[PDB]
């Protein structure tokens, strides 16, 4: 019973590999050889946000390119004003361990997730005048890793129990559940149209998930080690993954294979966060070895190095307009690079 | 218009800074423990005597301690363990004695010890089920000799002190497991973080004082590292 199914799965994988080899008409590097190089990029630190006590695990920019949300392991969720280095909001979290934070596109709600397995959503309307828990969500057995706002009433969330959830914030119950993963789901990235999203996970595969259908349309397996973070190209047709094998990979949904691998021989340390720019020409990746690298997407070369963090850069975020880049590391500092 | 918004924002910044400077003393004074242990090992007895994560809040000698017990979590530990580098100590509680559980415990301790981001976090080590191990070795079943070959060609260390009422075979097994953990801890030989092994009974009140003294030694050695004396 098991043999006729495992051999059938191996045959289907071989058919997918043969279809990918048949559709591999050329390489991105070969056609992008005749492209003018970006060159060395110098980014200066313009602001430095110093409010956190413990390590800053994750961050998420706002859609107005003005306010940023940063979560720390001490139990503090801080909403920062990037321009003036002023702390707009301080929230004391019930659970100290928080692995993610997200800011709603409207801006009313901020969500945090952690080892407590409960996602806490806070309303910033403040009719009372004090920040209070709008809702707490407890549907995941595994450790909660990533959450992102689709809108005011729906939130896509990632957990360690090999499941991705879509939660209706008004009801407080999961709208749908995604069960395709065989490994811990490290992160997810929402596309700008919001029809689809991508989940990077510890099973060395990245999954394209359809929100309405509830199943994974595409599976990408180009990574040797755990995929720590995932982000979208601005058009929404491609995505980049940072993994522990010190390689960044750009995958195309329509091509259904790995377009490009970014790697360097000296850099053996892991990758913690990736994020594109507004145009997509520059890929910004926060590596384990105490620096961030700016990569030319077309030419697969290192445009720049941002060595502004003494400790490992846990999270990297890029504004929607593209004006600034904010990097959060485990030395309790936030660095803004322009 | 801009001046009023800047004023209000500066006042909010001042209030938040005052809140963070009142919480900074609390965060730096209160020390943190990660109670990691196998399911066979009695960490439930530990959280009785001493959601996803469980929390025990207490204080000894006007020193605040929070101990965090892993609750309902997936067996894949390789990502969330990185979050626990910031805690002052990882208390690792194993059972000494069906499936083999000592070797998996040794491998898990090796994984904790050799982690590059756990080279500054010290491990306090609890060897539980001393009475159960004594009953097993007195029963005449050579479970430890079958599981570990070195135990047969093993001599009890002279510096080690035997508790009264204990067979020399019991002490030989106890200090043999202690030397297994010592060899795993000393194989790296980095010296940045130290492991303290303490035998613990099924019912004992000394464990809180042992954790207090071990955390004293951890903080003192970390300060000595800062002063470059050690």
């Amino acid at each position: 019973e098991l043999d006729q199914l495992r051999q059938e799965a191996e045959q289907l994988k071989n058919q997918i590999r043969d279809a990918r080899k048949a559709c591999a008409d050329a390489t991105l590097s070969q056609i992008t050889n005749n492209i003018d190089p970006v060159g060395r990029i110098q980014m200066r630190t313009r602001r430095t946000l110093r409010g956190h006590l413990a390590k800053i695990y994750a961050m998420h920019w706002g859609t107005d390119s003005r306010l940023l949300v940063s979560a720390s392991q001490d139990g503090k969720l801080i909403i920062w004003d990037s321009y003036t280095t002023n702390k707009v909001h301080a929230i004391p979290l019930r659970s100290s361990w928080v692995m993610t934070c997200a800011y709603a596109p409207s801006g009313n709600y901020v969500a945090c997730g952690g080892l407590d397995n409960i996602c806490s959503i806070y309303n910033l309307k403040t009719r009372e005048g004090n920040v209070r828990v709008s809702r707490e969500l407890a549907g995941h057995t595994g450790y909660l890793s990533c959450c992102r706002f689709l809108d005011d009433n729906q939130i896509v969330t990632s957990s360690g129990d090999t499941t991705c959830a879509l939660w209706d914030i008004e009801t407080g119950q999961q709208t749908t559940t995604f069960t395709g993963h065989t490994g811990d789901v490290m992160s997810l990235s929402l596309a700008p149209d919001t029809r689809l999203f991508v989940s990077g996970a510890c099973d060395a595969s990245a999954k394209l998930w359809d929100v309405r259908e509830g199943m994974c349309r595409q599976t990408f397996t180009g990574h040797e080690s755990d995929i720590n973070a995932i982000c979208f190209f601005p058009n929404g047709n491609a995505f980049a993954t940072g993994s522990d094998d010190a390689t960044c990979r750009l995958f195309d949904l329509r091509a259904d294979q790995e377009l490009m691998t970014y790697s360097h021989d000296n850099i053996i340390c892991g990758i913690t966060s990736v994020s594109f720019s507004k145009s997509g020409r520059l890929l910004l990746a926060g590596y384990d070895d105490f620096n961030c690298n700016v990569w030319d997407a077309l030419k697969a070369d290192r445009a720049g190095v941002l060595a502004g963090h003494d400790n490992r850069v846990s999270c990297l975020g890029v504004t929607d307009d593209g004006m600034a880049v904010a990097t959060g590391s485990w030395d309790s500092f936030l660095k803004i690079w322009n | 218009d801009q001046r009023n918004e800047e004023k209000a924002q500066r006042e909010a910044n001042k209030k938040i800074e005052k809140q963070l400077q009142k919480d900074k003393q609390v965060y730096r004074a209160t020390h943190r423990l990660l109670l990691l242990g196998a399911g066979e090992s009695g960490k439930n007895t530990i959280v009785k005597q001493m959601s996803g994560i469980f929390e025990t809040k207490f204080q000894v000698d006007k020193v605040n301690f929070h101990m965090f017990d892993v609750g309902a979590q997936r067996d894949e530990r390789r990502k969330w363990i990185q979050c626990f580098n910031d805690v002052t100590a990882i208390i690792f509680v194993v059972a000494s004695s069906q499936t083999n559980r000592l070797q998996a415990a040794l491998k898990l301790f090796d994984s904790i010890w050799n982690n590059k981001w756990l080279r500054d976090t010290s491990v306090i080590l609890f060897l539980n089920k001393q009475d159960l191990l004594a009953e097993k070795v007195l029963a005449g079943k050579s479970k430890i000799e079958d599981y570990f070959p070195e135990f047969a060609r093993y001599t009890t260390p002279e510096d080690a002190t035997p508790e009264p009422g204990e067979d020399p075979r019991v002490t030989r097994a106890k200090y043999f497991i202690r030397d297994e953990f010592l060899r795993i801890s000393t194989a790296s030989g980095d010296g940045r973080h130290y492991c303290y092994p303490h035998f613990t009974c099924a019912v004992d009140t000394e464990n809180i004082r042992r954790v207090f003294n071990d955390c004293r030694d951890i903080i003192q050695r970390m300060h000595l590292r800062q002063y470059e004396l050690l």
Partner: nanobody, 128 residues
Framework: QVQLQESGGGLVQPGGSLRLSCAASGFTFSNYKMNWVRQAPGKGLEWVSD????????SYTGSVKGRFTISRDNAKNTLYLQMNSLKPEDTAVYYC?????????????????????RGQGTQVTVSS
């Protein structure tokens, strides 16, 4: 795609000898520490033996220490396990597992049920 393919096994007699192979496809084989896990029928996963990146550091489970020989071939990309002086208590399903990260000493969750970086396994039975 990271894939591991165990080879060899079967029904064998005690006191005999047996060779196992692990075809490692889809990753840079030279940079990963790897190891063996076994599952006894009706029991949980327990660690067997390991081998580092270069192959200098080698360790075994005590119950099979001195009885197994692990060796990795980075040129031909295959992990080789030699098993002599077999025991009836050593019948199990064998898993050739890879440690998750490159250039790291620590193999955190190699011995867990739903771990995704191990092969499908092979059946080894020792009945007289």
């Amino acid at each position: 795609q990271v894939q591991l393919q165990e080879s060899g096994g079967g029904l064998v007699q005690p006191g005999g000898s047996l060779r196992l192979s692990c075809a490692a496809s889809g990753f840079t084989f030279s940079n990963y520490k790897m190891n063996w896990v076994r599952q006894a029928p009706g029991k949980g996963l327990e660690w067997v033996s390991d081998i580092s990146q270069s192959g200098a550091s080698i360790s075994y489970t005590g119950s099979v220490k001195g009885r197994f020989t692990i060796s990795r071939d980075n040129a031909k990309n295959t992990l080789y396990l030699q098993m002599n002086s077999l025991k009836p208590e050593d019948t199990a399903v064998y898993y050739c597992a890879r440690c998750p990260a490159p250039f790291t000493r620590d193999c955190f969750d190699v011995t867990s049920t739903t771990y995704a970086y191990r092969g499908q396994g092979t059946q080894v039975t020792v009945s007289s």
